[PDB]
Amino acid sequence: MKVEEILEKALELVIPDEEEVRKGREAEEELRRRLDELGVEYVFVGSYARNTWLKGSLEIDVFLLFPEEFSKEELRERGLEIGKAVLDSYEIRYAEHPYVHGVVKGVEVDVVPCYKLKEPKNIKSAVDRTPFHHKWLEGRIKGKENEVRLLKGFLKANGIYGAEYKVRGFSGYLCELLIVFYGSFLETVKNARRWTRRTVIDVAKGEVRKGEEFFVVDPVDEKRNVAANLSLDNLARFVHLCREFMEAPSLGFFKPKHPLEIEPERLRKIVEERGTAVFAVKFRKPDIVDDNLYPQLERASRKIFEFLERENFMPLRSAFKASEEFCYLLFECQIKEISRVFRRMGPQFEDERNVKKFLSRNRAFRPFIENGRWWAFEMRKFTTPEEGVRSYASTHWHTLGKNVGESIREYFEIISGEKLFKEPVTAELCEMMGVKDCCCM
Amino acid sequence: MKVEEILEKALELVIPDEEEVRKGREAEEELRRRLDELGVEYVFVGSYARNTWLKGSLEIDVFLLFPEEFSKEELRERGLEIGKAVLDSYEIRYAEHPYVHGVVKGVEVDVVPCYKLKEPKNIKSAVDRTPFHHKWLEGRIKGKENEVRLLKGFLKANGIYGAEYKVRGFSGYLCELLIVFYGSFLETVKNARRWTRRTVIDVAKGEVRKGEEFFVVDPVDEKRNVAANLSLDNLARFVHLCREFMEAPSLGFFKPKHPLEIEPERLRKIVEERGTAVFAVKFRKPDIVDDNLYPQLERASRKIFEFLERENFMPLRSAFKASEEFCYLLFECQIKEISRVFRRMGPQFEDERNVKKFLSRNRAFRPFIENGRWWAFEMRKFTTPEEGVRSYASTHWHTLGKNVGESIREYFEIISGEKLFKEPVTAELCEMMGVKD
RNA sequence: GGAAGUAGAUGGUUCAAGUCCAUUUACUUCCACCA
RNA sequence: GGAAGUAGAUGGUUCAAGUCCAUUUACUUCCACCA
């Protein structure tokens, strides 16, 4: 299979077919009629209005253009008022910028209020660049919309499409900019192989530059890094994907993998081969949006992780899962059990004052002089990493993220061994320990 | 109690009785005759020849004065013959400088060939300072002989008297200098408390001066560090014992403290209480003098310790013992068992050539990326500190001292649990673990 | 909500804290939720 | 025999270890065995 042949087949995975374009076309018209009837300024932007949305995930963005002078609170009431007035059914869940999600004639719509600006310098709301993004792309993306989709499907299938916190990947917009820059998906990929953590792509200036971090300049706002929330590791994954793809291209790369059911037994055997302690801290899921949730789960992971490390449990890797009603903070450590006694350092032998303060303390064991300074043996209050975290999470819940922290305080438990393998975390477990052959399609 | 009171009763244990004195006096009379019907130039030196030896251990030092043109050839051969022809029974074991050790009418004697110089500068044989030590000390010590005797007794009861590598403590010539310097035992203990690791003591200039490290200057060799072999930790032990003695003076500071050994079962209980892995590497004690052995054992000890720590077993401390037949290298780790899997660091995601290489290796688990570099899981070859040191000891014998390495090469074993507790290391295991009572 | 910087104030730990664990006031950004 | 210092000779481990683990020559001391 030549590289150009795989792509022709890959287009079938990404070009929306007619039924979905029509559904979209008549959703759009209905939207128009409704927003006309209300006599409001609106515009269609995003992937629908540029024809770069993916087969299977049609969503229309309608943007409301308000006077710059409106208060943030006004922007909010009116935005919602109109969004609610126009959608067949709706749902309002956001993290900071207010907008309403909904459905019109079976199709998904964001209706998002923003400020009508003359320039996208000194943005007032965080969505203000969007109409300009559209304006800039409108006539550079014609005839390339399929190169965009290839890139989006390619990233989607390797789980790095989306700039949201759940993903820390590539936005659709970022994808569009890349095609405008390179000219095709193929050219994008060919070049990505040479991207580095210092790479700066400046599209408006048509230039690739070195800098302090991976930076993709927005043509609409030179200060914006379109790749701001692309995690370093996902960058590295993408360049790698590219290098692999060029060497051995297949339809594989455009097909997504789904984790496999793993018998809790295979899982038991694997864990005892590695000879490690594995456990999750399980707690009720705070009822909040993903974009609030995930940073906090990351915070929790790290915080506990660093505890495990400084208490010498030598943790290998951490992971986390949000499920329907619970969350899980997963860890794997090299030390299943540590000794009760440990060393604590005292002062040098010349500090009469402090030494005699130091060996004042009542201890089970005679303290000793080494390398000219004193040393004491103390007892740990926990000897296994599970006990360690039972203590840590009970007493440091406040540090663990505002919402998860409050959750952990109210309740949590530590699960390990087989009780843990029957829990919906096998996917993360395999991923975390790098278990071979546990994903598919 | 009141302090001078304490010294009174304590003098009785450092001072030799007429019984022991006479014993020497007449062994000295025999010596003086036997040496003079051979026309060999000689002088007596050391604690014997300045009335500063201890109740118990009595030794006599006889020094053979030799012409300087004599090579290390004629020095050894003649100087040995002489002692061999003077003593009743003798040994000739030594590390560098040759001498003969022996018995004359039931008392300990040392006869030592050396050069009769005039200048101690540009020294020839290792001991040549010693007759000059005496010349300097002869009349200077007169009176203060008791105050010396107290210092030695104090150090011996607290196990820090001597200079040999077994003790790395205080030479009995350093002990004399301190008394000479500070006047008495009480003033010596008094100022010791205020010594630092950089204290510099000079006697032929009487200056409590400071410098680069703990350096007591010999009168007869300005450039000689009489405290050279005193270990930092033992200097640290001394100035603390002094601070302790001063606050609560007791007879038990001259009573050699005995670690009356502990039951294999009370030991067992303690280690499971501490919850750590204690074990020893045991091998055939090489046939070498102490002053060769211990530095070597220290070396062997340290290398394994360092292995263990970089291997992440978190060793607590080391020790070592040498018996009739065997040496023991003792260790305690916080980690009885580590996981099989571990983390190996790959290159950074950019370096394409090296990534391929890192990825080409067969492993049981997929490698991963973390903060922009590749990592892999790999498997350990050992998971307990015992198995670990078995490996290190087999692979690295050559680096564990000349004679101790060779011995471990032939044979060694890893010794732990109750098998270990019935080996003659009970005392050192305590000292090491900080056990009380 | 999360992260980065600035100017601080606390508590705990420890012989010892500008250096470890945490708490907290003010300013300055920035990211996610739309693109 | 151990330690310190001067100029080098490698081998093993590893994606690469000029940095991790060891091997080896020349030279300049020091220290213990007596005090």
Swiss-Prot record, chain A:
Catalytic activity, as annotated: a tRNA precursor + 2 CTP + ATP = a tRNA with a 3' CCA end + 3 diphosphate; a tRNA with a 3' CCA end + 2 CTP + ATP = a tRNA with a 3' CCACCA end + 3 diphosphate
Annotated CTP binding sites: S47, R50, H133, K152, Y161
Entry binding sites for Mg(2+): E59, D61, D110
Keyword tags: ATP-binding, Magnesium, Metal-binding, Nucleotide-binding, Nucleotidyltransferase, RNA repair, RNA-binding, Transferase, tRNA processing
Binding-site residues for ATP, renumbered to this chain: S47, R50, H133, K152, Y161
GO molecular function terms noted in the UniProt entry: ATP binding; CCA tRNA nucleotidyltransferase activity; CCACCA tRNA nucleotidyltransferase activity; magnesium ion binding; tRNA binding
EC number annotated for this UniProt entry: 2.7.7.72
EC category name: transferase
Cofactor (UniProt): Mg(2+)
Functional description taken from the UniProt entry: Catalyzes the addition and repair of the essential 3'-terminal CCA sequence in tRNAs without using a nucleic acid template. Adds these three nucleotides in the order of C, C, and A to the tRNA nucleotide-73, using CTP and ATP as substrates and producing inorganic pyrophosphate. tRNA 3'-terminal CCA addition is required both for tRNA processing and repair. Also involved in tRNA surveillance by mediating tandem CCA addition to generate a CCACCA at the 3' terminus of unstable tRNAs. While stable tRNAs receive only 3'-terminal CCA, unstable tRNAs are marked with CCACCA and rapidly degraded.
Subunit structure: Homodimer.
PANTHER family, per the entry: CCA-ADDING ENZYME
Matches recorded under HAMAP family: CCA_arch
Protein family according to the UniProt entry: Belongs to the tRNA nucleotidyltransferase/poly(A) polymerase family. Archaeal CCA-adding enzyme subfamily.
Something else known: A single active site specifically recognizes both ATP and CTP and is responsible for their addition. In contrast to the eubacterial homologs, the specificity of the nucleotide-binding pocket is determined by both the enzyme and the tRNA.
Protein name: CCA-adding enzyme
Originating organism: Archaeoglobus fulgidus (strain ATCC 49558 / DSM 4304 / JCM 9628 / NBRC 100126 / VC-16)
Gene: cca
